[PDB]
Amino acid sequence: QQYECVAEIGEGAYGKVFKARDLKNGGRFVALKRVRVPLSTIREVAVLRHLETFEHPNVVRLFDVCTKLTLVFEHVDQDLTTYLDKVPEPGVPTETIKDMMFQLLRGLDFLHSHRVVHRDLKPQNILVTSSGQIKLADFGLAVTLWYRAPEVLLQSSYATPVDLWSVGCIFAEMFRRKPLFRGSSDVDQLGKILDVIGLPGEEDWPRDVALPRQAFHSKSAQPIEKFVTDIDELGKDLLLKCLTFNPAKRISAYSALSHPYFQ
Ligand SMILES: C[C@@H]1CCCCn2ncc(-c3nc(Nc4ccc(N5CCN(C)CC5)cn4)ncc3F)c21
Secondary structure (H helix, E strand, O other), X not given: OOEEEEEEEXXXXXXXXXXXXXXXXXXXXXXXEEEOOOOHHHHHHHHHHHHXXXXXXXXXXXXXXXXXXXXXXXXXXXXXXXXXXXXXXXXXXXXXXXXXXXHHHHHHHHHHHOOOOOOOOOOOOEEEOOXXXXXXXXXXXXXXXXXXXXXXXXXXXXXXXXXXHHHHHHHHHHHHOOOOOOOOOHHHHHHHHHHHHOOOOHHXXXXXXXXXXXXXXXXXOOOHHHHOOOOOHHHHHHHHXXXXXXXXXXXXXXXXXXXXXXX
C-alpha cells in the first residue's frame, strides 16, 4: 500500500483513524481514515475535495482519496483535549485563548460560508499543530453530548448555529480546562445548560419538540463569571452570544470574527 499504518489515534462512529507513513512523500506522518460501503457519499466527498482547493489554514489538509474508501489527511501531532491536559498551571495564557478562538472562528466561518455544518464540534476534533495552529477535522462526512446545541438536543434545527453553541463550550473550557455542561443524557444535558444560561422565553422554545419548556425548572439565568473564571468583560459578551438558546438570535461565526474581543 502507498501508506503504512503505525498506530491508531482515533475510533468512533466517524470511522477508524490511523497514524501512518506517507511512503511516497518522504515518510511524513499522515492520518488515514476508512469509510464503509451509495451516491450521498459521492456528494460529501466532492465537497471535501472542493474545500481543499482553498487550502484553508484552519482545516486539516486532504492529501489523497482512495478506493472501501480511504481518506488521507495531514497528521497534526496532538488534539485540543491533550493540549489542555499537558498545558502548565495555572492554565492557558489569556491571549493564547484569544488567538486559538480566532483560528477556530475562521475555520468555522470558512466551513459555514461554503454551507458546511460540522455538527459535532468538540475538543477531540480540534487539532493543534506543533506551531500552535488550530486545524479542524472530522467534518463534511456522515457519544458525547457535552457540546451539543440545545436545538439538537430538543431535535428541531440542525443548522450552522449548532456549531456556534459548541464554540461556546470550547471557549469556556479554555478557561476551565474542564467541560462546562457535562450531562449523561440529552435530557440531562439540556438541564445542565438551562441551569446556567437560564430558562428562555416561551417563543424561544421550538415547536413540535417532545420536550416542552415547562418540563424544566431552572429558575434563574446565572452569571457566567461564576462557572467560568478569568474571563474579561469582552470574553463574557462574546461567550454569552455563542451560548444563546434561540439559534436565530445566536451569533454567527462571521459576526463573531468582527467582535471587540479580537482587537
Ligand atoms: C483521530 C483524530 C481525532 C478524533 C476525530 C477523528 N479525526 N479525524 C481526523 C483526525 C486527525 N487527527 C490527527 N492527529 C491526532 C489526533 C488525535 C491524537 N490522539 C492520540 C490518542 N490520544 C489518546 C489523544 C490524542 C493524535 N493525533 N491528525 C490529523 C487528523 F486528520 C482525527
